[PDB]
Design an enzyme around this catalytic site. Structure first.
Site: not given
Ligand SMILES: CC(/C=C/C(=O)NO)=C\[C@@H](C)C(=O)c1ccc(N(C)C)cc1
Ligand SMILES: [Zn+2]
Ligand SMILES: [Zn+2]
Ligand SMILES: [K+]
Ligand SMILES: [K+]
Length: 383
Positions: A19, A27, A101, A153
Site C-alpha cells: 500500500c 496491512h 488509509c 481466494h
Molecule cells: C482476508 C483475511 C485472510 C486472508 C488469508 O489469510 N488468506 O487465506 C482475513 C481478514 C478477513 C481478517 O479477518 C482480518 C483480521 C484482522 C486484520 N487486522 C486489523 C490486522 C485484518 C484482516
Molecule cells: Zn488464510
Molecule cells: Zn494502506
C-alpha cells in the site's frame, strides 16, 4: 538421495506489492512475510541444498486458464503498457476504491499499488507455475514457492482476501495442458477455505481438492466450503472440505490436523492416486495468530510432518506455495520445517508428547461429517 532435486522459488519483485500508506500495521499481507522466510532458509543452510529459482511473470494466456479475460486485463496490465491490445479492450478498461488509509484497493483488505501490484501478482503465479513444471517434467523431485500476494481466494473474476490470481490453480491447469490426462491433487491447509480453488475445479474430475479450514457453520472468512460441497457433474466427489466446526474452545491443533491426515487426507489421496500434488501452504493455522486471523495451534513440526506424508504420494512430486499466515516467527518455523522435509529429513512422531493426545471432540465430530458425506464416493470412507 539426489542433490538439487528440491526447488525453491523467490524474487524481490514480490516485495514491491505494498500500500502507498507505508503502514504494515493495517496491512497484514505485507512484504516482510516473504523476506523473513527467505533469509531463515539461508541461515539454517537449506537454501544451498536447493536448486534456487527466480521465477518470472505469468503470461496473460496462462492467467486466462483460470480467470476471465476482463479480470486478467484489470489486474494483469498497467496504464499504459507497451501491450498490443485492440481499442475495444482499451475502451473497456476506460469504462471502469478508496481505502481508509488513502491507498487504492480492490476492497478493504485487498490493496493495490498502482506501479507494482500487477507485476508482483503475475510473478507469484508464474513462479508457482514454473516451479511446478520442473517437477512435472521431473527435472526436480519437489519444491517450495516463497510467494506473495497469495492466491487461493481469487476466483474466475474476483480478487478478494489479499488475492488476485489463483497461482496454485493456474499452475494446476498449466501442468495438465502439458501432460494429457494427468490427475492433480490440491491440498489446502491454510486456515481459510480456498473458495477460488474449489470453484475453479468443482466440476472437474481430473483435480481433487482437499481443504482443511476453520468453518464454524458459515461464520469464518470467507464463509464458503461447507462439508456437503462435494463437487458437481463429472467432478462430484472430487471436492473434500474438511470443514472444522465448533469454534476456538476447545483448542484446534496438532492432534486434530494429524487425525485429519490419518483418517481423511491420506486415504482419499491414495485412492485418487494423483500424478502430482500442489499445496496451498498457508501458515495461519499456526500458533501465533489471534482469534480473528486463525486462533489455531498447529506447530511447525506438524506442518513439517504433513509435508513428509504428502511426499509418499505421486512418486514424491510435491510443490508447496505460500498462501496466508502472517506471524513472522510462526511462518518462518513452519517454512523451515516444510523445506527440511522436502529435502528428505524425517520427523519422528514419537518425539512429541503432545501428539499422544486424542483429537478434540469438535474435530472428531467434524471428521465424522466428512466421512458420512464422502462414503458415497470413496472406498476408504466406506463403512
Ligand atoms: C482476508 C483475511 C485472510 C486472508 C488469508 O489469510 N488468506 O487465506 C482475513 C481478514 C478477513 C481478517 O479477518 C482480518 C483480521 C484482522 C486484520 N487486522 C486489523 C490486522 C485484518 C484482516
Ligand atoms: Zn488464510
Ligand atoms: Zn494502506
Ligand atoms: K484451507
Ligand atoms: K475436482
Amino acid at each position: 538421495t539426489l542433490p538439487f532435486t528440491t526447488g525453491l522459488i523467490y524474487d524481490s519483485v514480490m516485495l514491491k506489492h505494498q500500500c502507498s500508506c507505508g503502514d504494515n500495521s493495517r496491512h497484514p499481507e505485507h512484504a516482510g512475510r516473504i523476506q523473513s522466510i527467505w533469509s531463515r532458509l539461508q541461515e539454517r543452510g537449506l537454501r544451498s541444498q536447493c536448486e534456487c529459482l527466480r521465477g518470472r511473470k505469468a503470461s496473460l494466456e496462462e492467467l486466462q486458464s483460470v480467470h476471465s479475460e476482463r479480470h486478467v486485463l484489470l489486474y494483469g496490465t498497467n496504464p499504459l503498457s507497451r501491450l498490443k491490445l485492440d481499442n475495444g479492450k482499451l475502451a473497456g478498461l476506460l469504462a471502469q476504491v478508496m481505502l481508509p488509509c488513502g491507498g487504492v484497493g480492490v476492497d478493504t483488505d485487498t490493496i493495490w499499488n498502482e506501479l507494482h501490484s500487477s507485476n508482483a501478482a503475475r510473478w507469484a503465479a508464474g513462479s508457482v507455475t514454473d516451479l511446478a513444471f520442473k517437477v512435472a517434467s521431473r527435472e526436480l523431485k519437489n519444491g517450495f514457492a516463497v510467494v506473495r500476494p497469495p492466491g487461493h481466494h481469487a476466483d474466475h473474476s474476483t480478487a478478494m482476501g489479499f488475492c488476485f490470481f489463483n497461482s496454485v490453480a493456474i499452475a494446476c491447469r498449466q501442468l495438465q495442458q502439458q501432460s494429457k490426462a494427468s490427475k492433480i491433487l490440491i491440498v489446502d491447509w491454510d486456515v481459510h477455505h480456498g473458495n477460488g480453488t474449489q470453484q475453479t475445479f468443482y466440476q472437474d474430475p481430473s483435480v481433487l481438492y482437499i481443504s482443511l479450514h476453520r468453518h464454524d457453520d458459515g461464520n469464518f472468512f470467507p464463509g464458503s466450503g461447507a462439508v456437503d460441497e462435494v463437487g458437481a457433474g463429472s467432478g462430484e466427489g472430487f471436492n473434500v472440505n474438511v470443514a472444522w466446526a465448533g469454534g476456538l474452545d476447545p483448542p484446534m491443533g496438532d492432534p486434530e490436523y494429524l487425525a485429519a491426515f490419518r483418517i481423511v487426507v491420506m486415504p482419499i489421496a491414495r485412492e485418487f492416486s494423483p500424478d502430482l500434488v500442489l499445496v496451498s501452504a498457508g501458515f495461519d493455522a499456526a500458533e501465533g495468530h489471534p482469534a480473528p486471523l486463525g486462533g489455531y495451534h498447529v506447530s511447525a513440526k506438524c506442518f513439517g510432518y504433513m509435508t513428509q506424508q504428502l511426499m509418499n504420494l505421486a512418486g514424491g512430486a510435491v510443490v508447496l506455495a505460500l498462501e496466508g499466515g502472517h506471524d513472522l516467527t510462526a511462518i518462518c518455523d513452519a517454512s523451515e520445517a516444510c523445506v527440511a522435509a522436502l529435502l528428505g529429513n524425517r520427523v519422528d512422531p514419537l518425539s512429541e508428547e503432545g501428539w499422544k493426545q486424542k483429537p478434540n471432540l469438535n474435530a472428531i465430530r467434524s471428521l465424522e461429517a466428512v466421512i458420512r458425506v464422502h462414503s458415497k464416493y470413496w472406498g476408504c470412507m466406506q463403512r
